[PDB]
Amino acid sequence: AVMEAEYERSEALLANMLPGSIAERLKSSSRSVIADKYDEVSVLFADIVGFTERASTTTPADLVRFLNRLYGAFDELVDKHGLEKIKVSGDSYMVVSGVPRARPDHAFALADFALDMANVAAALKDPHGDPVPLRMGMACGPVVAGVVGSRRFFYDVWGDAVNVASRMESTDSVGRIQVPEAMYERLKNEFVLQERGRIEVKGKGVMRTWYLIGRK
Amino acid sequence: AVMEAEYERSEALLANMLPGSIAERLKSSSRSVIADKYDEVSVLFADIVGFTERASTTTPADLVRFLNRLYGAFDELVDKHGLEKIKVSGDSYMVVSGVPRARPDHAFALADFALDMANVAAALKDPHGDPVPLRMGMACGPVVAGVVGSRRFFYDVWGDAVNVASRMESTDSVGRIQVPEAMYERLKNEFVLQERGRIEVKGKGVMRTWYLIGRK
Ligand SMILES: CNc1ccccc1C(=O)O[C@H]1[C@@H](O)[C@H](n2cnc3c(=O)[nH]c(N)nc32)O[C@@H]1COP(=O)(O)OP(=O)(O)OP(=O)(O)O
Ligand SMILES: CNc1ccccc1C(=O)O[C@H]1[C@@H](O)[C@H](n2cnc3c(=O)[nH]c(N)nc32)O[C@@H]1COP(=O)(O)OP(=O)(O)OP(=O)(O)O
Ligand SMILES: [Mn+2]
Ligand SMILES: [Mn+2]
Ligand SMILES: [Mn+2]
């Protein structure tokens, strides 16, 4: 009986770290590599503005604790919208819509998620009592998802979509949700958007950028 | 009988994904943040040069299989040196020296590892037949190592050192190991170092940087 409550603890943690399907895949003995092509997924990057500056007022341990509190809020939100959190690179938080079950409304869900996230972040304050500014940028396109390496692995996504969302985040103005022109073309029918214009993005040149404002 | 076999695969997967002690800490009902202070550790960042362009000549999933091959070789090299692999995120590979057990020779061991890694990578070729260039950066200092957020728990390490180790990689010239002055002072007695000079790093200002050339 205690064998099955430790198995329960173990299965719950395993389910927490990998998507069910990927976990099932690893539990088989398939020496084959996990690498799946997906035609159309949407990817969002969120990054706190001017984080290393908080190194003056907060200790490193209180900065990790702040991260854990804030990402607990966002995590609660990816469960609410039922989207896929991939990873966290220190200050960035990555959410993907369309993996591993693709859905046709991925672009809309990641749009709603983005807006919902924004309000929530506006509501939080950093450990020193100041607001938490976010740069957010999203994108859509083809992606490869899978697992690399033998230990310390996770489910990761790579692709053209993650590159141009990355650029939408790095080049965003604070507190705004930047979308590229192809996702604007996809979103203009249910969301309100305001043009930002031409921007230079590394590896892609210059493209049109729009701001996500709210629902129609 | 099958409910101890499934449990054996499940615990085994959990074994490879997390440090043992962290697995149990996550399985307990501790409401406390998993954040352990470590005094002196060194962090290495490696990133492949011009990886996105290879999508022209190789299909995306074959690149995942290559990635998995290259980073598998590196995982072997960290067992050889007895260091701590943290993660591989897209193109990036982070190794830590000094956790969980600190060693007086942590910076020397991560220096030898950087060099051994550069030789193994110089010997390898991409699926298209071209070389694989790396950008490498190292740093040492105090680190908070742990798990943040409520879904997709990953054992990660944070701090000033990881910040400047990333800046040392992203700002490096290809095929070189950029280290800042605080590590140059540490290594200069057993390694050969060549000054690159003063460069601007976000969140740190301007720092004098050195290249690790080889063992004395
Ligand atoms: C003293 N610095 C810290 C103390 C405790 C915890 C974290 C840090 C810290 O420096 O985190 C930074 C990265 O090391 C840390 N970190 C970043 N990427 C990674 C990563 O990939 N892995 C790990 N383990 N840590 C990472 O994120 C932080 C922000 O880096 P940004 O590039 O986002 O700069 P910024 O200050 O936000 O201004 P801007 O981004 O708006 O331009
Ligand atoms: C269409 N491109 C691909 C096809 C198949 C598999 C991977 C890719 C691919 O683009 O991988 C990159 C990200 O999509 C993907 N990526 C995945 N997650 C992330 C992420 O979280 N942040 C960023 N910036 N990139 C990510 O892994 C790679 C990160 O690449 P870099 O930004 O380092 O570009 P580079 O070519 O090495 O240029 P440079 O090093 O000389 O500057
Ligand atoms: Mn930031
Ligand atoms: Mn960041
Ligand atoms: Mn990268």
Given a contact cutoff of 8 angstroms between Cβ atoms, the answer to whether B44 and B94 are in contact is yes
A58: three-class secondary structure by DSSP: coil
Tokens 């003063």 correspond to B198
User: Does the annotation flag B48 for ligand binding?
Assistant: yes
In single-letter form, the type of residue at position B16 comes to N
Identify which of B78, B193, B83, B176 has the alpha carbon closest to the alpha carbon of residue B136.
B176
**A181 C-beta neighbours (distance < 10 Å), count:** 12
Q: Which residue out of A4, A17, A85 would a mutagenesis test of the B interface target, given it has the greatest number of B Cβ atoms within 10 Å?
A: A17
Identify which of B49, B8, B32, B67 has the alpha carbon closest to the alpha carbon of residue B169.
B49
Q: Please state the φ and ψ torsions of residue B183, each to the nearest 5 degrees.
A: -90, -30
Identify which of A138, A177, A145, A181 has the alpha carbon closest to the alpha carbon of residue A161.
A138
Q: Please state the φ and ψ torsions of residue B12, each to the nearest 5 degrees.
A: -70, -40
User: Does the annotation flag B47 for ligand binding?
Assistant: yes
Minimum-distance CB partner of B71 among A35, A149, A162:
A149
The whole-angstrom distance between residue A67's C-alpha and the CA centroid of its chain comes to 15
Tell me the structure's resolution in angstroms, rounded to a single decimal.
3.4
CA–CA distance, A34 with A146 (Å, rounded to integer): 5
Tokens representing residue B52 in the block: 């996105």
Contacts of B110 (CB under 8 A, 6+ apart): B42, B43, B44, B83, B95, B97, B138, B140
CA–CA distance, A19 with A42 (Å, rounded to integer): 17
- β A177-180/A134-146 pair status: parallel
Residue B154 burial (10 A CB sphere; 0-12, 13-18, 19+): buried
Give the Å distances, CA to CA, from B31 to A8, A23, A74, B28, B148.
Answer: 19, 26, 18, 9, 12
Minimum-distance CB partner of A61 among B3, B37, B160:
B37
Q: Which residues of B touch A35 (CB under 8 A)?
A: 60-62, 64-65
Cβ of B161 below 6 Å from ligand 1: no
Structural domains in chain B, CATH included, are 1-216 (3.30.70.1230)
Lining ligand 2 with CB less than 6 A are: A 89, 94, 144, 158-160, 162-163, 166; B 47-52, 55, 60, 63, 89-91
Tell me which long-range contacts B52-55 makes (C-beta under 8 A, separation of at least 24). Answer: B52/A163, B52/A203, B54/B126, B54/B127, B54/B128, B54/B130, B55/A160
Q: Which residues of A touch B159 (CB under 8 A)?
A: 60
Minimum-distance CB partner of A13 among B27, B89, B158:
B27
User: Cα torsion at B198, B199, B205, B207 (round to 10°)?
Assistant: -40
Give the residue whose CA is nearest to atom 29 of ligand 2.
B91
User: Does the annotation flag B86 for ligand binding?
Assistant: no
Identify which of B116, B126, B124, B163 has the alpha carbon closest to the alpha carbon of residue B50.
B126
**Eight-class DSSP state of A61:** H
Residue B155 burial (10 A CB sphere; 0-12, 13-18, 19+): buried
Interchain contact, A75 vs B204, CB within 8 Å: no
Nearest chain A residue (CA) to B70: A149
Residue B174 burial (10 A CB sphere; 0-12, 13-18, 19+): exposed
Query: ∠ at Cα A195 (A189, A196), nearest 5°?
Result: 145
The whole-angstrom distance between residue A115's C-alpha and the CA centroid of its chain comes to 13
User: What one-character-per-residue DSSP string does chain B give?
Assistant: -HHHHHHHHHHHHHHHHS-HHHHHHHHS---S-EEEEEEEEEEEEEEETT-GGGGGTS-HHHHHHHHHHHHHHHHHHHHHHT-EEEEEETTEEEEEES-SS--TTHHHHHHHHHHHHHHHHHH-B-TTS-B--EEEEEEEEEEEEEE-SSSS---EEEEHHHHHHHHHHHTSPTT-EEEEHHHHHHHTTTEEEEEEEEEEETTTEEEEEEEEEEE-
Q: Which residues of B touch A203 (CB under 8 A)?
A: 52
Given a contact cutoff of 8 angstroms between Cβ atoms, the answer to whether A137 and A177 are in contact is yes
Identify which of B47, B148, B53, B149 has the alpha carbon closest to the alpha carbon of residue B95.
B47
Q: Which residues of A touch B72 (CB under 8 A)?
A: 149-150
Given a contact cutoff of 8 angstroms between Cβ atoms, the answer to whether B74 and B130 are in contact is no
Tokens representing residue A214 in the block: 């709210």
**Eight-class DSSP state of A172:** P
Tell me which long-range contacts B187-192 makes (C-beta under 8 A, separation of at least 24). Answer: B187/B107, B187/B108, B187/B111, B187/B212, B189/B216, B190/B108, B190/B111, B190/B215, B190/B216, B191/B108, B191/B111, B191/B215, B191/B216, B192/B216
CA–CA distance, A11 with B65 (Å, rounded to integer): 28
CA–CA distance, A96 with A36 (Å, rounded to integer): 15
Given a contact cutoff of 8 angstroms between Cβ atoms, the answer to whether B152 and A87 are in contact is yes
Give the minimum alpha-carbon distance from A23 to chain B in angstroms, rounded to a whole number. Answer: 9
CA–CA distance, B1 with B3 (Å, rounded to integer): 5
Report the first-to-last Cα separation within chain A, whole angstroms: 54
The whole-angstrom distance between residue B137's C-alpha and the CA centroid of its chain comes to 9
Q: Indicate which technique resolved this structure.
A: X-ray
Q: Please state the φ and ψ torsions of residue A17, each to the nearest 5 degrees.
A: -90, -30
**A113 C-beta neighbours (distance < 10 Å), count:** 22
Identify which of B192, B191, B209 has the alpha carbon closest to the alpha carbon of residue B200.
B209
